[PDB]
Amino acid sequence: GVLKIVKVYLAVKRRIQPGDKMAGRHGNKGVISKINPIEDMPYDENGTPV
Amino acid sequence: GPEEITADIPNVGEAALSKLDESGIVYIGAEVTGGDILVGKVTPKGETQLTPEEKLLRAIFGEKASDVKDSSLRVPNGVSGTVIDVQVFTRDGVEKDKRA
Amino acid sequence: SVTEFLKPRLVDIEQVSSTHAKVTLEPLERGFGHTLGNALRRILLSSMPGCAVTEVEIDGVLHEYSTKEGVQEDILEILLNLKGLAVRVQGKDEVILTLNKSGIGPVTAADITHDGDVEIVKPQHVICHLTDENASISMRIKVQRGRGYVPASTRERPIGRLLVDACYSPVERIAYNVEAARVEQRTDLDKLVIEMETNGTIDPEEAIRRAATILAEQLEAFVDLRDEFDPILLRPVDDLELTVRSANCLKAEAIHYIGDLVQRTEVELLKTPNLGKKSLTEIKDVLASRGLSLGMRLENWPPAS
């Protein structure tokens, strides 16, 4: 009873945002709480932020 | 009667059919959001009795409108993306369209 | 004197490289070096203007999740490469560049068609690679000026136009140091050295001056410290084609607008003299002809006029 089938594929890109879950390899997991502007971050003697 | 996959839907505007090709299937690379039409399809609803009002409707707005109804595939609400691939499967013995 | 501060001046600029510079400010009073340095660093990292690629059109491609025959890279990788193209525009806030290439080899920024008001500061920037002799690429690239970071999702288009996230800031990093200044006859003055790393599209001195101008404009506020209804409701009652007696009854009640009429209930109209059920039915009919009804509630009427 089936004449035809049409399949459509949609692609999207997801960026990182507060509420996403991150982890290391040692069981240290967490959730992102805030995206901080570049000049608010701690930096070293050469001006390189983390 | 069989359902037809077509680009000619009587109850939708010209703008809503702009992203469909001649076969009633969306183009590759189109940006779509919730509510947009991907595949246009109609379902038969014809009857063998024609009332005077039905005759007036057919005379003024055409016979295609009075025979079929919209059953198209639409993007679910809250979904967006880009069309990157389309596949068509046709039963053996049925004629193939341009896209296939 | 006590109320006499020494004003810093720009002493020297050391152009270590095309993208690395040092700027010296001297002399500075006790404590002003850090006060100026931190504010200047924040402004320089935050608010400098620049140009960036925002749109790309390639002849044979429809979207970015695809490939081109004879090209080593995906379309996404080409867009990422174009996101790091440093361009200086001399006379306008928008420009379109053209790239045409063919043959085996790398396609770099030196292959972009020359423009009078467009300068390429890194001609060796690689864009893609062509791996076939009978292969060619042609594209149009849109560049415009701005500041900050504007992702393409926040900001119809024909199929084939590819959006690129815009990073307008030309400054890569800022560092600063405060040292002792060997002034003629004092030993309590400082010197501020600012190390600047950019992409080569902005002059250090004009960056410093622009940051100082922004800071002064923001300061000038502290320097002087001190302390819709729907249109149909606004139409007059006589716009309704009411009968003579209905119009007289409504005028006797001092109703001059539709907003006044729709707020009145059926009971109040019925209790009014000289208004029967027929005229109230006619009023309801003419209101229903425009999709209105009696018994609506409104806040802040009359509409301040």
Side-chain angles (χ1 to χ4, degrees), chain A, chain B, chain C residues 1-3 5-225 227-305:
Chain A
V2 175
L3 293 171
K4 286 194 297 185
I5 301 181
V6 182
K7 294 187 178 183
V8 185
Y9 297 87
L10 301 179
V12 81
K13 275 188 291 189
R14 308 284 189 186
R15 304 194 306 161
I16 218 65
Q17 59 177 324
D20 286 334
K21 189 178 171 185
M22 316 295 293
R25 287 176 292 181
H26 308 270
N28 44 327
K29 50 173 179 174
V31 159
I32 296 178
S33 61
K34 178 185 180 59
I35 308 296
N36 214 29
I38 183 63
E39 70 276 350
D40 288 59
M41 303 294 297
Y43 62 100
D44 53 66
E45 269 94 337
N46 297 274
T48 302
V50 297
Chain B
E3 292 180 350
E4 185 186 19
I5 292 177
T6 178
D8 190 6
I9 289 85
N11 37 321
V12 302
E14 179 73 8
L17 301 170
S18 54
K19 288 200 287 289
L20 302 179
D21 76 329
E22 52 183 337
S23 304
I25 307 179
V26 70
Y27 294 112
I28 296 298
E31 313 286 351
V32 298
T33 180
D36 289 359
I37 301 177
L38 302 177
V39 184
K41 197 180 61 181
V42 297
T43 305
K45 64 177 185 63
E47 297 178 355
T48 60
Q49 183 177 6
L50 296 182
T51 60
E53 51 267 19
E54 192 70 21
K55 290 217 309 174
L56 181 62
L57 285 174
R58 298 171 98 261
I60 298 188
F61 291 91
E63 290 74 18
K64 181 71 182 304
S66 58
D67 288 325
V68 299
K69 71 175 186 62
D70 194 319
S71 54
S72 300
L73 171 69
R74 286 183 171 86
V75 183
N77 197 76
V79 176
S80 61
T82 298
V83 181
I84 59 167
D85 193 61
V86 169
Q87 298 174 353
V88 180
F89 307 93
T90 307
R91 187 183 63 197
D92 188 63
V94 184
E95 61 91 44
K96 302 177 184 298
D97 47 332
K98 306 286 288 300
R99 195 64 168 264
Chain C
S1 180
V2 183
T3 61
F5 271 150
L6 290 177
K7 314 304 174 184
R9 297 192 68 90
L10 208 159
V11 172
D12 66 84
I13 301 179
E14 177 180 350
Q15 193 75 52
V16 180
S17 174
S18 58
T19 56
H20 185 188
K22 291 186 177 63
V23 180
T24 297
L25 293 77
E26 181 184 3
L28 282 170
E29 302 278 1
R30 188 99 299 177
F32 273 102
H34 296 267
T35 305
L36 287 184
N38 187 69
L40 285 181
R41 179 181 184 268
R42 293 178 63 83
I43 298 177
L44 287 164
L45 284 175
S46 193
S47 308
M48 292 298 100
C51 302
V53 172
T54 59
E55 268 145 311
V56 177
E57 282 182 351
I58 309 179
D59 272 338
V61 329
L62 305 168
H63 52 96
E64 63 191 26
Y65 314 92
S66 58
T67 59
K68 192 181 185 302
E69 192 184 44
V71 185
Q72 179 92 25
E73 292 83 3
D74 282 324
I75 307 303
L76 261 174
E77 190 161 359
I78 299 176
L79 297 179
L80 293 178
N81 287 334
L82 281 171
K83 186 176 166 59
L85 181 64
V87 171
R88 187 150 49 185
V89 186
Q90 270 71 10
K92 39 186 176 179
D93 297 332
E94 181 177 327
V95 70
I96 295 184
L97 315 171
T98 303
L99 212 175
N100 303 279
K101 192 68 184 305
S102 61
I104 297 185
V107 185
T108 59
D111 301 328
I112 298 182
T113 302
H114 178 81
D115 199 319
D117 299 331
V118 176
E119 178 192 356
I120 309 295
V121 309
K122 188 186 180 65
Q124 321 89 26
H125 182 69
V126 177
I127 299 182
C128 60
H129 290 92
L130 296 178
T131 63
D132 193 6
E133 276 292 347
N134 297 118
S136 61
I137 189 169
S138 65
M139 44 176 153
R140 288 141 299 278
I141 308 164
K142 187 176 178 179
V143 179
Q144 59 188 32
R145 182 179 286 100
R147 72 167 187 259
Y149 166 68
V150 184
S153 59
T154 58
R155 68 173 188 261
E156 307 181 18
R157 305 176 299 102
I159 294 181
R161 182 180 297 176
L162 313 177
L163 303 183
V164 181
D165 292 325
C167 293
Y168 293 105
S169 187
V171 177
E172 309 299 321
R173 75 165 165 86
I174 299 292
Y176 69 94
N177 274 269
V178 183
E179 295 104 357
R182 295 292 171 261
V183 85
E184 177 63 38
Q185 206 62 38
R186 299 178 61 175
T187 54
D188 59 319
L189 301 181
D190 291 321
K191 170 186 60 178
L192 179 62
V193 180
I194 303 178
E195 177 168 351
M196 188 182 311
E197 174 81 20
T198 61
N199 59 8
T201 52
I202 186 175
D203 185 66
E205 180 169 343
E206 66 166 330
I208 296 296
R209 297 189 70 94
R210 204 180 302 260
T213 303
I214 296 173
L215 181 54
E217 284 182 334
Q218 293 296 299
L219 253 18
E220 82 184 9
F222 289 89
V223 182
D224 308 77
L225 189 66
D227 282 312
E228 191 75 297
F229 295 89
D230 206 75
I232 187 179
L233 296 172
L234 302 177
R235 309 203 62 81
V237 167
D238 52 8
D239 205 322
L240 280 61
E241 297 84 329
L242 288 174
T243 57
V244 182
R245 63 171 308 177
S246 297
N248 296 334
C249 293
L250 289 200
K251 179 166 58 182
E253 291 295 330
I255 299 181
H256 307 282
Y257 299 94
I258 304 181
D260 302 328
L261 179 60
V262 299
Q263 295 184 224
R264 307 288 180 85
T265 189
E266 294 183 3
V267 184
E268 289 177 12
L269 268 309
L270 190 53
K271 292 223 197 70
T272 49
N274 310 119
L275 193 77
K277 197 182 70 176
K278 169 191 175 183
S279 296
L280 185 57
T281 302
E282 180 223 358
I283 292 179
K284 289 184 298 181
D285 187 298
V286 302
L287 283 184
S289 180
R290 289 111 183 277
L292 298 175
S293 298
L294 292 178
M296 303 167 61
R297 308 201 315 271
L298 296 178
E299 276 187 348
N300 293 94
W301 189 270
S305 62

